[PDB]
PDB file of all heavy atoms in Angstrom:
ATOM      1  N   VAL A 127      51.297 129.632 -60.101  1.00  2.00           N
ATOM      2  CA  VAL A 127      51.229 131.059 -59.567  1.00  2.00           C
ATOM      3  C   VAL A 127      50.507 131.094 -58.279  1.00  2.00           C
ATOM      4  O   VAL A 127      49.370 130.592 -58.190  1.00  2.00           O
ATOM      5  CB  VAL A 127      50.637 131.911 -60.619  1.00  2.00           C
ATOM      6  CG1 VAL A 127      50.357 133.357 -60.137  1.00  2.00           C
ATOM      7  CG2 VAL A 127      51.473 132.064 -61.906  1.00  2.00           C
ATOM      8  N   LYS A 204      56.379 114.077 -88.167  1.00  2.00           N
ATOM      9  CA  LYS A 204      56.482 114.203 -86.789  1.00  2.00           C
ATOM     10  C   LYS A 204      56.770 115.521 -86.376  1.00  2.00           C
ATOM     11  O   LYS A 204      56.174 116.086 -85.266  1.00  2.00           O
ATOM     12  CB  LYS A 204      57.524 113.196 -86.242  1.00  2.00           C
ATOM     13  CG  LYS A 204      57.118 111.674 -86.341  1.00  2.00           C
ATOM     14  CD  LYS A 204      58.230 110.746 -85.847  1.00  2.00           C
ATOM     15  CE  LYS A 204      57.744 109.418 -85.918  1.00  2.00           C
ATOM     16  NZ  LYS A 204      58.885 108.301 -85.496  1.00  2.00           N
ATOM     17  N   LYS A 352      48.279 143.819 -88.449  1.00  2.00           N
ATOM     18  CA  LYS A 352      48.700 142.522 -89.021  1.00  2.00           C
ATOM     19  C   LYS A 352      47.928 142.195 -90.429  1.00  2.00           C
ATOM     20  O   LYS A 352      48.362 141.356 -91.118  1.00  2.00           O
ATOM     21  CB  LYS A 352      48.318 141.325 -88.083  1.00  2.00           C
ATOM     22  CG  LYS A 352      48.853 141.581 -86.688  1.00  2.00           C
ATOM     23  CD  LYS A 352      48.349 140.498 -85.771  1.00  2.00           C
ATOM     24  CE  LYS A 352      48.724 140.766 -84.203  1.00  2.00           C
ATOM     25  NZ  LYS A 352      48.235 139.631 -83.436  1.00  2.00           N
ATOM     26  N   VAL A 391      18.117 147.866-100.560  1.00  2.00           N
ATOM     27  CA  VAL A 391      18.151 147.132 -99.373  1.00  2.00           C
ATOM     28  C   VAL A 391      17.360 145.823 -99.702  1.00  2.00           C
ATOM     29  O   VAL A 391      16.154 145.977-100.112  1.00  2.00           O
ATOM     30  CB  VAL A 391      17.868 147.735 -98.175  1.00  2.00           C
ATOM     31  CG1 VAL A 391      17.593 146.849 -97.032  1.00  2.00           C
ATOM     32  CG2 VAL A 391      18.834 148.774 -97.711  1.00  2.00           C
ATOM     33  N   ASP A 607      32.023 111.950 -98.677  1.00 15.57           N
ATOM     34  CA  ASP A 607      30.673 111.724 -98.686  1.00 15.57           C
ATOM     35  C   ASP A 607      30.189 111.687 -97.230  1.00 15.57           C
ATOM     36  O   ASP A 607      30.627 110.946 -96.479  1.00 15.57           O
ATOM     37  CB  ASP A 607      30.411 110.185 -99.295  1.00 15.57           C
ATOM     38  CG  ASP A 607      28.970 110.025 -99.481  1.00 15.57           C
ATOM     39  OD1 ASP A 607      28.196 110.452 -98.629  1.00 15.57           O
ATOM     40  OD2 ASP A 607      28.683 109.261-100.413  1.00 15.57           O
TER      41      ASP A 607
END
Side-chain angles (χ1 to χ4, degrees):
Chain A
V127 170
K204 286 179 180 175
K352 312 174 190 182
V391 168
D607 190 327

